[PDB]
Amino acid sequence: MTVGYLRPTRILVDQNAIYENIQNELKHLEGTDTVIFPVLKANAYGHGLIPVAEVAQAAGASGFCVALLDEALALRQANFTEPILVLGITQPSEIELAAANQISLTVGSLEWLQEAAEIAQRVPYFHPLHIHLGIDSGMGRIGFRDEAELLAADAFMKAHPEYFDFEGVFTHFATADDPDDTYFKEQSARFNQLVAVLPKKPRFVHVSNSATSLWHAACNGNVIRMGISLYGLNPSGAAIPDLPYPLKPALGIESELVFVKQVAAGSKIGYGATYEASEGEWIGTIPMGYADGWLRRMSGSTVLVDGQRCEIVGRICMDQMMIRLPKRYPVGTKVVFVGKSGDDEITLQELAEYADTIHYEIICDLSDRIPRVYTGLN
Amino acid sequence: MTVGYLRPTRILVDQNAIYENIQNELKHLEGTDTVIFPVLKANAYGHGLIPVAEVAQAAGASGFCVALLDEALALRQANFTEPILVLGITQPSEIELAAANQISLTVGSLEWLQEAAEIAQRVPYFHPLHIHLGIDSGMGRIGFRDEAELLAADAFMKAHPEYFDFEGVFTHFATADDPDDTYFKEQSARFNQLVAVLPKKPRFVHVSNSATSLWHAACNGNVIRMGISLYGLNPSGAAIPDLPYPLKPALGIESELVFVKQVAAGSKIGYGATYEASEGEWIGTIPMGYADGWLRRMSGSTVLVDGQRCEIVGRICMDQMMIRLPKRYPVGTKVVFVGKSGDDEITLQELAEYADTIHYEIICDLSDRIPRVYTGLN
């Protein structure tokens, strides 16, 4: 958890980009009453929980979504007072913490409510929990999967208003970013069938991740759980290239050369001696490694130095890596991992493709050992 | 950086294991004057910088190695007073911080020393830096590669004792964990050749990572930079199971089921609907995802529940994943990712093999969102 402020490896977060992305979605929503609850789980997708919450609030966020009770508590402790929804399951033993901090909880079973009521009944002066019922419409993760148990949960909260405030109902789509919308339409029809058994809807009815808001807006309820698009990234990677408005990428990554040398032919570079240089090759060393989240699978990809693509050669080490340079550069020369250099640019999508993963994972894997530097809001 | 204390996902760190590992290497070293500087970079290989420093101190550590000046400063701020060596390059502009905190610095070029002296000359009351010259004997990472520059660096420090204390000289091996020792002996001969031309050796002369101390102990200098083996893990993965003393793995990983359901045939699970269930399959949901460092590449591997293997099915999500259960289990049932369950066990080496990487990366990629729980010392 030590932050490497003195090391010249940095994550750059453009808060103006985040502000514009959110404002564009608000514009996209005009003519409805739909509000935006930015999704800030996983340290705001690696961008930094509190700084992203600050700009999101300035940009017009009406509430927040997180993965864990601990993340919601962290927002409350930073003096945010908006509604906060924990999207994962919180065990019933923690309901007193949630109720005392007005944290809204996702509930996917009648059993959870029964257990929570047994606990709450023993708490003097208990104040009601704000509950969102999670409906599993085909993601298979958490939530109710039939009408009967859903209505039983609805009835149980009505029987115990001293413990439960039915605040929301929601589902999540597995394929809203798929060029084939067959399964999305199946899930949307299934959610609509299931929520139809509720005699009265709660104040929040929501289904939309970024992809749903971007490409299936007619299916929006009255909250957008805006995640990846807030950070300026296409939810689909490249599968659905066209967007209803432009996304401005918020995150860049930079470092510097800390060592530069020229080597003779056959010189072995890195662990396992897996790379052998050519004659007169220039090798640059960079203080970034797999402990920072630049995993060994990134060997053979390129960084940008002075507008030139430079291959990562040999094995990536825990804290350092080596690149092939086209000529001698001074120690301290900027290296661009993500972002623009010269007339070129390395995107998170292109890195995700090289790593055989998705950009969500690239940014979420960035270690807190790398300091985040923010533009501030113009 | 928000730690998930309320989530039932935890890393278990056995400090007694670390103590025994260090004590076994100390016994392995008896009859020499060699001391151990445990390597604590990357938050002590994901185990926790300060708790591992505390037990390593209790077990007989004489000093510490880290990757970054920031990590060394964190150790000083936790009131550790032993020598601390930064193994990576620290840029010359930070020498006042290293000098004011008695942090020893790796230096790999005469140019670094020249730039450092220009800075230090402008500092009233400057106190000398403790320098280790890093020699590149064939790793190709950082360090001197020729006799002339090394001797020029030695003479330059002697011209400026107000700024520099020549405290150590070292190299690092690329293939000390290789059953073939050919390149290892080439590096060792090359280092011995370069150090032989120093007019006088400094107080620390060191070459040894874990693999060197385990399988090439005759080549030890007077300090062991003990890394992975301190954490109970074989430096070679599975390439060299033959060890001089047993290693006790220090790290386990455990979670709980937060949701359990039985699904109909054809039910699709996870993002992209990539897994289709068979009739009556039991699906468990676990609050662990790729944002915690259980990356998407782990889909299809197994966890242990109640002594039985359970496949991670479908895509792993940012904060959650789904497994196939052999039968219904209660919510709250323990899940073992690393460690023992029943008559079975999952090791970090097995998981690294599944992930096409090394166990070093698995442990360094564990997010701080997972709390570490420590046994303490008997």
Tab-separated table of C-alpha atoms in Angstrom, chain B residues 28 30 52 75 94 101 135 140 149-150 225 228 282 294 302 316 338 354 362 374:
chain	number	residue	atom	x	y	z
B	28	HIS	CA	22.114	-23.050	6.233
B	30	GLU	CA	26.286	-21.065	9.781
B	52	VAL	CA	6.690	-9.188	7.254
B	75	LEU	CA	10.145	1.236	6.700
B	94	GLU	CA	16.001	12.439	-4.604
B	101	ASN	CA	16.948	8.800	6.099
B	135	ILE	CA	27.265	-4.640	-11.571
B	140	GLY	CA	21.085	-6.891	-18.756
B	149	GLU	CA	33.550	2.750	-15.794
B	150	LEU	CA	33.446	0.717	-12.591
B	225	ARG	CA	19.028	-10.941	-0.573
B	228	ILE	CA	10.691	-15.641	-2.544
B	282	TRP	CA	-25.787	-25.987	-8.255
B	294	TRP	CA	-8.148	-13.191	-9.500
B	302	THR	CA	-10.809	-24.959	-9.460
B	316	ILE	CA	-14.954	-13.956	-13.825
B	338	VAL	CA	-5.059	-21.241	-1.828
B	354	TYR	CA	-2.843	-22.749	-14.813
B	362	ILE	CA	0.077	-14.282	-8.506
B	374	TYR	CA	-1.772	-12.568	10.376
